Enzyme design. Structure first.
Site, PDB file in Angstrom:
ATOM      1  N   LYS A 174      -7.185 -13.584 -53.064  1.00  0.00           N
ATOM      2  CA  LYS A 174      -8.192 -12.542 -52.864  1.00  0.00           C
ATOM      3  C   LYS A 174      -9.413 -12.661 -51.764  1.00  0.00           C
ATOM      4  O   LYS A 174     -10.200 -11.723 -51.629  1.00  0.00           O
ATOM      5  CB  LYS A 174      -8.823 -12.180 -54.251  1.00  0.00           C
ATOM      6  CG  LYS A 174      -7.529 -11.669 -55.241  1.00  0.00           C
ATOM      7  CD  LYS A 174      -8.291 -11.502 -56.813  1.00  0.00           C
ATOM      8  CE  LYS A 174      -6.906 -11.357 -57.507  1.00  0.00           C
ATOM      9  NZ  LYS A 174      -7.524 -10.950 -58.982  1.00  0.00           N
ATOM     10  N   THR A 211      -9.330  -8.781 -62.296  1.00  0.00           N
ATOM     11  CA  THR A 211      -9.926  -9.527 -61.094  1.00  0.00           C
ATOM     12  C   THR A 211     -11.587  -9.946 -61.344  1.00  0.00           C
ATOM     13  O   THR A 211     -12.189  -9.252 -62.010  1.00  0.00           O
ATOM     14  CB  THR A 211      -9.895  -8.809 -59.885  1.00  0.00           C
ATOM     15  OG1 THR A 211      -8.684  -8.636 -59.318  1.00  0.00           O
ATOM     16  CG2 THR A 211     -10.694  -9.283 -58.618  1.00  0.00           C
ATOM     17  N   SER A 212     -11.692 -11.235 -60.868  1.00  0.00           N
ATOM     18  CA  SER A 212     -13.054 -11.856 -61.123  1.00  0.00           C
ATOM     19  C   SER A 212     -13.310 -12.263 -59.724  1.00  0.00           C
ATOM     20  O   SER A 212     -12.486 -13.509 -59.315  1.00  0.00           O
ATOM     21  CB  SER A 212     -13.150 -12.826 -62.289  1.00  0.00           C
ATOM     22  OG  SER A 212     -12.445 -12.403 -63.487  1.00  0.00           O
TER      23      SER A 212
END
Ligand SMILES: [Cl-]
Ligand SMILES: [Mg+2]
Ligand SMILES: [Mg+2]
Ligand SMILES: [Mg+2]
Ligand SMILES: [Mg+2]
Lengths: 244, 204, 241, 243, 196, 231, 240, 195, 219
Positions: free
Chosen positions: E33, E1-2
């Site tokens: 997200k 995840t970023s």
């Protein structure tokens, strides 16, 4: 606070009587008469339904006679709903005993348990007692055929023949007159029906106003069999005994 | 250590033409030690038959539990419980111990009294139902039973043909399992007669 | 005569505490009205600020329960706010559990069931309020559902509540007898509010300033209350025809 | 009859007589007031000097909630303290969860719902106080008054206790004569006067004046007690107006 | 995840990749997200998907009930509710959440809540496995009071690099812009951001 | 009348009769006086015997090294409330290394008494307390009523015939407040104050109970021949 | 808030009467008439939709409720009390039966469970009895079609046909003359509409009458409960 | 504890149980009676974890004695064994399970039959002509399988039991200090004082 | 197990294989893995079977009660929530892995629910041991807004991939097509493998088994 509204259901009167028990017994005296007669070769349970109508589905109806297990049954006099609460508790106790000891519950042990539950409602909790009197008809291999009764006080007693509900005074005198110790089931069937026929507040005793059951040890192979009589079978036994 | 193979034993059930069969070995052991040759694993509640393999204390406990429940059922319902209904009761009862389960392998067998339809079923220890028409197997020789049943079984067998099929499936499976055998029982179940036969087998 | 103090049956099969809670309903001396448009549901209610020392902005009997549901209350403010807080809590819990906005009628039923409990259990008193719930439901469209101290509830085409409810009720009945439809056939909510005010004026026989009324409007995906100036604009339009 | 013997019982009118009897205990208490000013609120109360033996300035009646809300009440003093203790719990849990100090309208409803709950059951007695409270939040100044029933509204000015009619009349004059508003320092002076004027209803015993205030400019939106020179200035202003 | 959130002149923008992995398998390549807890208060989620979804749903409930009683909550209030849940249940949670929101009074605000459940108010914040690779880049390139277009470019370039180096990040770059004007959703596909 | 059956019921005039009846129990109790200067605070109490064979009921209870009270009314209720004060004083010391302020002690007693006046099933406390103490803001005297009303005073008296002592203190106010750094003279003023409430009986050696707390004086109780000096 | 009502609010009087149950039955008597008739191939239950206001939408108020796919219920007495019994009956049919056995309860047992709930409100602490009498119609595989009445006491009785509430005494006499053991479902619906017309004052049509049947399966199996539409009622009122 | 044996003959049940009590290094006692009389015609021997064995046995004894007084009746051996099994089956899923194995030897006065029940700590019940717990069966069962007849006399049962104990004394590594032997028949329970 | 779902133009298409195993043994070759939630919503299940079976049954029951009270069809989001929140509460200990698909008042929706209580809302999903084989087919050929028979074939093609290439998957292919106008429950949609034919009859003749004793009891 809340004290203001409390009837105090578990107190003695100045005379040492339990108000609510006494008044519950008064209720039970207006319920349909139930009779139990113990013979050497079996037990008879006979009971009269109240306020019958033509449109009541009789063959699927049960207000008086209930099965607790394969060996023990009960005749009810009083509030039917109150009786069903207790009946389901008794059915569970019998299965708890069977699970624990791998033997069918002796009749008295079940009776004492139900009677103890009734007793509790008179001594604690502040709730009204159960407005029910039971006749217990059962068999076990210790005492054989047994009849008991219990009432809202939680007192129980054993009987050769007994009545509960309406006109028990009259019913008990008639039973006391014609009952003998060497009596058989077929004779006891006749006595039970004859007693109801004389004590009934109805004009005549018919099949549609009765519930009937027998516990007979006699069976093919000596096994105890409970027989809850069907409407047609009650009609036949009424003709056989010469009441209709 | 493994609770499902301490005591040992097997159950198999099969369907035939207007009939079902259920069978079990008679062994109870403590691992290597044979303890009893009269430990029956099939029980009945009315016309519904239940076989149970696995940990023997749980077998006994569950029998007692289902006798309890089916007795109350009958008193309330005013009729005997049916195989389909009982199957759901077993599943429910097992799953209510999801995180502390009974180490058992139940098998249901019976004929529905109203439709006449033969019925058999099986469950995992936590209640998942294996609902298969041909055959159900359970116990420490379940692999062996699967093998025997897959090659011997065919559909619509008459009661006495089905007896030979299930018996040979049980016997030959048990003989390839250290923890099964020591006698065997076979129930042949029809709509209104049940035949119970004890089989002669090797006692090692 | 303790059968009049707690919620147990009188010899006539009546619950006097429930009946007396209905009487507490009119203690504010306020009348409320609710009507349905095509795309909207409008609720109006009388506003009375008898004391000059009061902050008139804080005197309200209309509540924003959720984004979609509005509730007007006929009864004393403490019980009104009790019911308002509970309805808000219930509407929020519902959305969390079931993943969609609580419908107006489902909330109404829930609050009616709570009210039923107070009529059966002795330790709890009934709330002395009538609750009128309004929304534009995504499935049922414009919706009016009303709850009372008995625990009764039902849907409405339109409704009225208060001391002079009968006058308002008959006025509305007579209009819907003419039009032969279950709603106000109007595109804009502004005109449905104008209808609601006009028919309250006719029914009560009193004129209103901007500070004598309180208005709530439900549209698709929001319920909102009108400001005094928004009501004034409404009153100007009524007077000009 | 018997409808007034038990709390939460509706009379045939639709009234809760036990709550109405609680109001009588409030009416019996000393005079307390609240004044909403330009950027805040002022609270004042009459403290009856029953005896010379009372230590001056020691028996403090006005209570702080959080750091921004003042509470004053008339009636049964313990019942008021119990309500403020609850208020402090409500304000603490609000700030714990939401970080920001409790807004005044939010706080008002917390007290409101709690007082209302004490009219729902016969196992509890209603509160024997009317409570005047308020302060400064993000949306400005707010003054409330809360009754034994659980009823509350926002106020421009508020008064309760034995001298409430006198006080209310004085507050109504200020509202009429100052539509643009009243300053915080003016409201302190006026609060002193109104308590002194309302003291005619309790004229038998002499009294002690107590004043507090929350103002955005004068106290940084925090509740503070008026003390020393500013209190004496308000007393002098009050004494001049009665003569 | 970023994931990241960046304050700018007109408000705040949240950014995220769309990759969700079970080990090396990409279980969802088009994950969202960026999740809404109120009209103009959103959050970026990293950590356990079950935990951050559960938390975000609870927060949405809390703020919905707040709104019914007290009106529009501040971004600080939203962050506090997130913190409360994350701190008090630190032993049973794996959640790294960035909370971003637009008030009119406060304008754009960003709060980061790392694993422990601490709160840190920042001009911008980065998080998720891929964030490690862009600490250098983001620190060198962030300015305060950027324009909308500059901030979109800053987030696009940053997450582009995070995706390039982190195997656990990838897919599309989603963004959510929070200003007085309203709520704008943006999406940027691989063919666009890979050639930067 | 119809509204005195429990504490949860207001009368039509807004009175709480059970609380008023609890207040009556204090009036039946034996007299006790409290007074203070700027340096010391003193309790004086007239103890009551059952008969000539019996002991004289103790009236003064120590709550901490810097705080204690005298009672009038139901002595078991004083034991409950003084135990509560002991615990609260103790909690303050253990958790915060802080001696409990007398004013805060009063607030705690008020709130404890209040809960018994608003709930069904319970009853109000049937005792009045005079709390003396020396804390960070000097000497203090409090009067507790079981209504919940706690009051800080220079001097007071509660119990039967307490009005006489209270009037004396009201006259003497300017004198006894100035008795700084002289414990014996302050006690003398308290003994002279309680003497205004006596009838038929006088202060004997096993009748009188005195307590004092001050600047460099822990809370100490004097009984028996220790009070013969003041008779 | 301490619920201090831990004692019974229904007690025996000196005559052996349970006052609160009797008074609950009086509340049922005041209630609007409802009836049930059992045929050979079905059961019908019916009642009047006594609308409290013409502005009220009486379609949103359901007096006849589906309990299970094969069981329906109607009442006379206090509507709010009925509503909570229906909710509990629907729930108990799942918790105490369907989640155990994987099938819906037979009519007599679901009736037994409702009866139990009603009995408990007659004995438990701090509650009054329910002010309703229920009529529960249903079908199950082994018992066939059945019709039961349940009273405030918790007592229940099976019926071929019956009526409760306002004009029950007259309605029961009307049913005694018309009922036989060879009625088809359509005959029973016809008799239900005839019987119900006697106790209705005002408008008598599909919008003011609520009527449902337990009959054939409407296509696991189809539900036997079906509520008749406004139009379906009006069609049978022309052949009346 | 160590060795507990049981054998059901024609008209009685014989239980043989070792006398040793060992606590690790030392034999603390050589005359320990590992049995409790539950009712006049029902005897239970036991072996398992220290403390739990006696605690369990005495707990069962107390409950059966309570039943006997309440009903003025002696429960059948089958009924007592079912009660015992349920208590052990309950125990196995407890916080701390009873680690106790038992043999129940009873004479059913109704059926006029001796009955031997073997129940392990899991609640595994079996009715047997002869039984044992632990390693005792490993040594003795081959002898019992060979010699046992259902029509054996009490004296023949004791002789077959002697042979079993001799085999145990030969091949077991532990000195269990002999066995106390008790006979359960129609007349009740008695101890064989010379074995 | 291989279970899958897609969103097409008019609704949802769900698919599943039929192999149920015990270890490496196949216990049932025709097990139904597509489950009813409500009339408009169905669930495909993988993971621990008892858990999947029970969790779907419980939520289905609770939805039924919800739907009786509200008087409207239940939604997929409410089915998703109820499942999700329960699974989350049990922290992955209920090993239910589901593909949830249905059609609402708000249109067709498809979810994948994981044991720990996370969900994904997607146009196409796969689960079970055969997910990768099935997902390869979707990545290869899925497009949005497919027609019904096209979507049916894609799901069937996806399940087939799992059946053949995954040892944990096998048997028949089952579909469930959900739209506003209909619900088609196709069991079995396809039979990709013939049952093996046996060359001999090994069934024994009567009397072959040795019997000690027999008893016959009538009923
Ligand atoms: Cl509800
Ligand atoms: Mg073998
Ligand atoms: Mg061997
Ligand atoms: Mg009530
Ligand atoms: Mg990558």
């Amino acid at each position: 606070g809340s004290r203001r509204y409390d009837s105090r259901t578990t107190i003695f009167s100045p005379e040492g009587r339990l108000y609510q028990v006494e008044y519950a017994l008064e209720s039970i005296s207006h319920a349909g008469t139930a009779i139990g007669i113990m013979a050497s070769d079996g037990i008879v349970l006979a009971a009269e339904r109240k306020v019958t109508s033509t449109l009541l589905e009789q063959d699927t109806s049960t207000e008086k006679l209930y099965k607790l297990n394969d060996k023990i049954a009960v005749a009810v006099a009083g509030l039917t709903a109150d009786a069903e609460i207790l009946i389901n508790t008794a059915r569970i106790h019998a299965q708890n005993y069977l699970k624990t000891y791998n033997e069918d519950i002796p009749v008295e042990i079940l009776v004492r348990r139900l009677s103890d539950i009734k007793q509790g409602y008179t001594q604690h909790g502040g709730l009204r007692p159960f407005g029910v009197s039971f006749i217990y008809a059962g068999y076990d291999d210790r005492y054989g055929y047994q009849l008991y009764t219990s009432n809202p006080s939680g007192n129980y007693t054993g009987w050769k023949a007994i009545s509960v509900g309406a006109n028990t005074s009259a019913a008990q005198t008639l039973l006391q007159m014609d009952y003998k110790d060497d009596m058989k089931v077929d004779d006891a069937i006749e006595l039970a029906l004859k007693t109801l026929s004389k004590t009934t507040d109805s004009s005549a005793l018919t099949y549609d106003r009765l519930e009937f059951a027998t516990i007979r040890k006699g069976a093919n192979d000596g096994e105890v069999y409970q027989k809850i009589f069907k409407p047609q079978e009650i009609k036949d036994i009424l003709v056989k005994t010469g009441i209709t | 250590s493994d609770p499902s193979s301490i005591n040992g034993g097997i159950v198999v059930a099969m369907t035939g033409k207007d009939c079902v069969a259920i069978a079990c070995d008679l062994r109870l052991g403590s691992q290597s030690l044979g303890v009893s040759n009269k430990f029956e694993k099939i029980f009945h509640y009315g016309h519904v038959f239940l076989g149970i393999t696995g940990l023997a204390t749980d077998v006994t406990t569950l029998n007692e539990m289902f006798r309890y429940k089916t007795n109350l059922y009958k008193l309330k319902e005013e009729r005997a419980i049916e195989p389909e209904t009982f199957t759901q009761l077993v599943s429910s009862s097992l799953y209510e111990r999801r995180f502390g389960p009974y180490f058992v392998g139940p098998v249901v067998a019976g004929i529905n009294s109203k439709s006449g339809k033969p019925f058999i079923a099986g469950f995992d220890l936590i209640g998942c139902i294996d609902e298969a028409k041909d055959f159900i197997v359970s116990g420490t020789a379940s692999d062996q039973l699967f093998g025997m049943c897959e090659s011997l079984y065919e559909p619509n067998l008459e009661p006495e043909d089905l007896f030979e099929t299930i018996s040979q499936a049980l016997l030959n499976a048990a003989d390839r399992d250290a923890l099964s055998g020591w006698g065997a029982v076979v129930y042949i179940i029809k709509k209104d007669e049940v035949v119970k036969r004890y089989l002669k087998m090797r006692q090692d | 005569g303790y059968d009049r103090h707690i919620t147990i049956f009188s010899p006539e099969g009546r619950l006097y505490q429930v009946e007396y809670a209905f009487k507490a309903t009119n203690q504010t001396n306020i009348n409320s009205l609710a009507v349905r448009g095509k795309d909207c549901t409008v609720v109006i209610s009388q506003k009375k600020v008898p004391d000059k020392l009061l902050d008139p902005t804080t005197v309200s009997y209309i509540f924003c329960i959720s984004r979609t549901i509005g509730m007007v209350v006929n009864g004393p403010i403490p019980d009104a706010r009790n019911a308002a807080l509970r309805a808000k809590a219930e509407a929020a819990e519902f959305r969390y559990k079931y993943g969609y906005d609580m419908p107006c009628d489902v909330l109404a039923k829930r609050m009616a069931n709570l009210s039923q409990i107070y009529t059966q259990r002795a330790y709890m008193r009934p709330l002395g309020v009538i609750l009128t719930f309004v929304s534009v439901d995504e499935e049922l469209g414009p919706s009016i559902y009303k709850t009372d101290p008995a625990g009764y509830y039902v849907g409405y085409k339109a409704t009225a509540t208060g001391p002079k409810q009968q006058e308002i009720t008959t006025n509305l009945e007579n209009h819907f007898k003419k039009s032969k439809i279950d709603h106000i056939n109007e595109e804009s909510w502004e005109k449905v509010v104008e209808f609601a005010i006009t028919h309250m004026i006719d029914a009560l026989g009193t004129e209103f300033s901007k500070n004598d009324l309180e208005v709530g409007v439900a549209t698709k995906d929001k319920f909102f209350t009108l400001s005094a100036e928004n009501i004034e604009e409404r009153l100007v339009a009524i007077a000009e025809q | 009859t018997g409808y007034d013997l038990s709390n939460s019982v509706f009379s045939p009118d639709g009234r809760n007589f036990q709550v109405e009897y609680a109001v009588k205990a409030v009416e019996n208490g000393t005079t307390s007031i609240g004044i909403k000013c330009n950027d805040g609120v002022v609270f004042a109360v009459e403290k009856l000097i029953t005896s010379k033996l009372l230590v001056p300035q020691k028996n403090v009646k006005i209570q702080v909630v959080d750091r921004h809300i003042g509470c004053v009440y008339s009636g049964l003093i313990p019942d008021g303290r119990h309500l403020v203790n609850r208020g402090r719990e409500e304000a603490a849990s609000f700030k714990k969860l939401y970080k920001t100090p409790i807004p005044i309208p939010a706080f008002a409803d917390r007290l409101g719902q709690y007082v209302q709950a004490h009219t729902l059951y016969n196992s509890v007695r209603p509160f024997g106080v009317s409570t005047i409270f308020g302060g400064v939040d993000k949306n400005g100044a707010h003054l409330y008054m809360l009754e034994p029933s659980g009823s509350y509204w926002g106020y421009k000015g508020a008064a309760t206790g034995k001298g409430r009619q006198s006080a209310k009349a004085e507050l109504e004059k200020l509202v009429d004569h100052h539509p643009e508003g009243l300053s915080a320092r003016e409201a302190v002076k006026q609060a002193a006067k109104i308590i002194y004027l309302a003291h005619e209803d309790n004229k038998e015993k002499d009294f002690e004046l107590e004043i507090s205030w929350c103002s955005l400019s004068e106290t940084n939106g925090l509740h503070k007690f008026v003390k020393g020179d500013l209190l004496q200035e308000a007393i002098d202003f009050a004494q001049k107006e009665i003569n | 995840t970023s994931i990241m959130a960046v304050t700018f002149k007109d408000g705040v923008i949240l950014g995220a990749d769309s990759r969700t992995t079970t080990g090396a398998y990409i279980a969802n390549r088009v994950t969202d997200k960026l999740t809404r807890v109120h009209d103009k208060i959103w959050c970026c989620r990293s950590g356990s998907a079950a935990d951050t979804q559960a938390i975000a749903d609870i927060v949405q409930y809390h703020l919905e009930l707040y709104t019914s009683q007290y009106g529009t909550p501040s971004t600080e209030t939203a962050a506090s509710v997130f913190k409360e849940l994350c701190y008090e249940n630190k032993d049973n949670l794996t959640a790294g959440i960035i909370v971003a929101g637009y008030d009119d009074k406060n304008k754009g605000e960003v709060y980061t809540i790392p694993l422990g459940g601490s709160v840190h108010k920042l001009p911008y914040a980065i998080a998720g496995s891929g964030s490690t690779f862009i600490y250098g880049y983001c620190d060198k390139n962030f300015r305060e009071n950027m324009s909308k277009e500059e901030t979109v470019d800053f987030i696009k370039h940053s997450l582009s690099q995070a995706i390039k180096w982190d195997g656990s990040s990838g897919g599309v770059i989603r963004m959510v812009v929070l200003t007085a004007a309203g709520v704008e959703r943006l999406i940027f596909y691989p063919d666009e951001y890979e050639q930067l | 009348n119809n509204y005195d059956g429990d504490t949860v019921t207001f009368s039509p005039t807004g009175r709480l009769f059970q609380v008023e009846y609890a207040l009556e129990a204090i009036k039946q109790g034996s007299v006790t006086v409290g007074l203070r200067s700027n340096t010391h605070a003193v309790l004086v109490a007239l103890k009551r015997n059952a008969d000539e064979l019996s002991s004289y009921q103790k009236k003064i209870i120590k709550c901490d090294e810097h705080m204690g009270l005298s009672l009038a009314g139901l002595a078991p209720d004083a034991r409950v409330l003084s135990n509560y004060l002991r615990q609260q004083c103790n909690y303050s010391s253990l958790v915060f290394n802080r001696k409990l302020a007398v004013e805060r002690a009063g607030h705690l007693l008020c709130d404890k008494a209040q809960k018994n006046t608003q709930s069904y099933g319970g009853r109000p406390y049937g005792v009045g307390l005079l709390i003396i103490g020396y804390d960070k803001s000097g000497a203090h005297l409090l009067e507790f009523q079981p209504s919940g009303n706690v009051t800080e005073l220079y001097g007071t008296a509660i119990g039967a015939r307490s009005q006489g002592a209270k009037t004396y203190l009201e006259r003497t106010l300017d004198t006894f407040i100035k008795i700084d750094g002289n414990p014996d003279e302050l006690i003398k003023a308290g003994v002279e104050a309680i003497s205004q409430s006596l009838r038929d009986e006088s202060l004997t050696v096993d009748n009188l109970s005195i307590a004092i707390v001050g600047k460099d004086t822990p809370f100490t109780i004097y009984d028996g021949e220790a009070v013969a000096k003041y008779i | 808030m301490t619920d201090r009502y831990s004692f019974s609010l229904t007690t025996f009087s000196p005559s052996g009467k349970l006052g609160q149950i009797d008074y609950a039955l009086t509340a049922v008597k005041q209630g609007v008439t409802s009836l049930g008739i059992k045929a050979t191939n079905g059961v019908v239950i019916a009642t009047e939709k006594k609308s409290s206001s013409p502005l009220a939408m009486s379609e949103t108020l359901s007096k006849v409720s589906l309990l299970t796919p094969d069981i329906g219920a109607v009442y006379s007495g206090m509507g709010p009390d009925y509503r909570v019994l229906v909710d509990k009956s629907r729930k108990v049919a799942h918790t105490s039966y369907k989640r155990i056995y994987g099938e819906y309860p037979p009519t007599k047992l679901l009736v037994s469970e409702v009866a139990k709930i009603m009995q408990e409100a007659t004995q438990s602490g701090g509650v009054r009895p329910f002010g309703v009498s229920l009529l529960i119609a249903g079908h199950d595989e082994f018992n066939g079609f059945s019709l039961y009445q349940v009273d405030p006491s918790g007592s229940y009785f099976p019926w071929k046909a019956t009526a409760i509430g306002k004009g029950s005494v007259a309605a029961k006499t009307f049913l005694e003359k018309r009922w036989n053991d060879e009625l088809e479902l359509e005959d029973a619906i016809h008799i239900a509409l005839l019987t119900l017309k006697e106790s209705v004052e005002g408008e008598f049509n599909g919008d003011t009458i609520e009527l449902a049947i337990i009959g054939d399966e409407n296509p696991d199996k189809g539900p036997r409960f079906r509520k008749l539409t406004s139009q379906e009622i009006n069609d049978r009122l022309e052949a009346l | 504890m160590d060795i507990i044996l049981g054998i059901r003959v024609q008209d009685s049940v014989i239980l043989a149980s070792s006398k040793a009590v060992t606590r690790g290094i030392s034999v603390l006692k050589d005359s320990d009676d590992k049995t409790r009389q539950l009712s006049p015609h029902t005897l239970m021997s036991f072996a398992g974890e220290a403390g739990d064995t006696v605690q369990f046995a005495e707990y069962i004894q107390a409950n059966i004695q309570l039943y006997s007084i309440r009903e003025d009746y002696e429960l059948s051996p089958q009924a007592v064994s079912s009660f015992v099994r349920q208590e052990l089956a309950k125990s196995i899923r407890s916080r701390r399970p009873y680690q106790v194995n038992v043999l129940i030897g009873g004479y059913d006065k109704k059926k006029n039959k001796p009955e031997l029940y073997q129940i392990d700590y899991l609640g595994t019940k079996v009715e047997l002509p002869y039984g044992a717990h632990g390693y005792s069966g490993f040594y003795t069962f081959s002898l019992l399988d060979h010699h046992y007849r259902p029509d054996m006399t009490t004296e023949e049962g004791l002789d077959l039991l002697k042979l079993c104990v001799q085999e145990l004394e030969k091949r077991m590594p532990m000195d269990f200090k002999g066995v106390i032997v008790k006979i359960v028949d129609k007349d009740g329970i008695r101890q064989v004082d010379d074995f | 197990t291989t279970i899958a779902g897609v969103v097409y133009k008019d609704g949802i298409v769900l698919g599943a294989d039929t192999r149920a195993t015990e270890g490496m043994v196949v216990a049932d070759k025709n097990c139904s893995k597509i489950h009813f939630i409500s009339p408009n919503i169905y669930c495909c299940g993988a993971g621990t079977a008892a858990d999947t079976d029970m969790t779907t049954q419980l939520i289905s029951s609770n939805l039924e009660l919800h739907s009786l009270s509200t008087g409207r069809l239940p939604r997929v989001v409410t089915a998703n929530r109820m499942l999700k929140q329960m699974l989350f509460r049990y922290q992955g200990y209920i090993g239910a892995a589901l593909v949830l698909g249905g059609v609402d008042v708000t249109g067709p929706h498809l979810y994948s629910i994981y044991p720990h209580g996370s969900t994904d809302k997607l146009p196409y999903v796969t689960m079970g041991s055969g997910s990768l084989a099935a997902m390869a087919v979707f990545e290869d050929k899925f497009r949005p807004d497919m027609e019904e028979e096209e979507a049916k074939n894609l799901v069937s093609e996806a399940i087939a991939a799992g059946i053949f290439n995954d040892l944990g998957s096998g048997g028949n292919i089952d579909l469930c097509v959900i739209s506003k106008n209909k619900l088609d429950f196709l069991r079995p949609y396809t039979v990709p493998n013939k049952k093996g034919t046996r060359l001999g009859r090994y069934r024994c003749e009567k009397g072959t088994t040795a019997v000690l004793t027999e008893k016959i009891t009538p009923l």
